[PDB]
């Protein structure tokens, strides 16, 4: 499946959709990327409907 992240960084907001087999390796997928920007802080999982959402 595919979850979308929400990028709430007090310098950069955004989002990405990024394709993962489960949470774990999803958990760092985006991580990976927020840090090709600078957000690192807490990360939440939107299991709901599918929307990671990190806010450094």
Do not use: H
Request: charged residues 30%; hydrophobic residues 30%.
């Amino acid at each position: 499946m595919t979850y979308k992240l929400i990028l709430n960084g007090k310098t950069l907001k955004g989002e990405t959709t990024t394709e993962a087999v489960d949470a774990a390796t999803a958990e760092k997928v985006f991580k990976q990327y927020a840090n090709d920007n600078g957000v690192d802080g807490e990360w939440t999982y939107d299991d709901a409907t599918k929307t990671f959402t990190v806010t450094e």
